[PDB]
Symmetry: D2
Subunit: 114 residues, 4 copies
């Protein structure tokens, strides 16, 4: 039900081998680790969770943009890119979180479908 | 070698049934019709051209954003979104032109891969 | 009534010295030159037109992004970024056309105000 | 030395009355409140800090986008837009953090200048 897609606006390419960490907000308002991985050669990270586990709640997707840019020898602005949202059962069932990265900027969108 | 992907930033969805026209710049500097279609239920338009036909040159991809927004009952700013680029044989072989649409704004990127 | 602002997403800076050409669609459906200029050290281009001259019409703002990137040593994807819109069709408005540039991407927005 | 600018991509306008909270990472690795305010009728938030107070550190600018959209009748995707960055680590700089908002998307950039 959750996929993350990361693109590079400098090179016009997928952003490959980017670390992504997903957290779920706990009852005490802290962020508990939920899922993680590294983007593939297509800039995608699949397999993070299952329908059973991905219950309604507040989630944070953290994309390690700084390390990505540093590996390319480029000085970036942000420590990371953060996407924070509520999963809602009454909306469509599949969430794609997409991010388009530049050294001093990023764009993010959600594509939520059935 | 050419795919167009259109997303809706208001609804968080693919932008479905959007008209897309591709033109190739002619020797006399006019834009000659090249390919066209309507985005699918996934916001994608595949099958526009072939490797044989998609020779090096300057291309324009015109996305009919105004009609899209009007069909949703939303007043938009732009007449259309235009993406103009050179196809180059020495770069990667497959071009995805992606657009992320809002009523008064849009984002576009190119994902060029082998 | 028409201002253009250009930012560089690689440098985190205004995009300075960017050429901008504005056209207006004529009665015969061709794109007539309307005005032109270059962005300043703030990434802004002011003074393109006047409220008298900026009548209703369909306008195209062409931002010459390719030349900008090439001069930074980047061979960019796009030839230019074009922004096409109807202006002043409910009376005079002020338009800011903003663009944020990367070598293989850009975003553009408009801020439209009624004086 | 720190300004926040917020634009609305649906309306083509400044995003007015947007709450913004700035935090700074403390020695113990927690996010300490640093400053806060709301965007003006221009979509800008000035006066958050001073060059004396805005020392080197890791800062988080939280833009309360959800509340903004809900008040326009749109149930948006994100809880907020957060911008996290190291500041002033090569001496004082001026930072503009800009955000362009849609219900299911945003973009953000920084403009960093050396006075
Ligand atoms: C211009 C743009 C494209 C995308 C985009 N998301 C995509 C997903 C699959 C294939 C191509 C894609 O392009 C995402 C964002 C946040 C953007 O600002
Ligand atoms: C297209 C765009 C414009 C801006 C923008 N930032 C601006 C600052 C002052 C005036 C107009 C401005 O437009 C910011 C972002 C994150 C964008 O994606």
């Amino acid at each position: 039900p959750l996929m993350v897609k990361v693109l590079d606006a400098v090179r016009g390419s997928p952003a490959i081998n980017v670390a992504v960490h997903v957290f779920r907000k706990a009852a005490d308002d802290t962020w508990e680790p939920f899922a993680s991985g590294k983007t593939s050669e297509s800039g995608e990270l699949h397999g993070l969770t299952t329908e059973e586990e991905f219950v309604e709640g507040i989630y944070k997707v953290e994309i390690d943009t700084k390390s990505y840019w540093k590996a390319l020898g480029i000085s970036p602005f942000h420590e990371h890119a953060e996407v924070v949202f509520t999963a809602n059962d009454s909306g469509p069932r599949r969430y794609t979180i997409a991010a388009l990265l530049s050294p001093y900027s990023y764009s993010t969108t959600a594509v939520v479908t059935n």
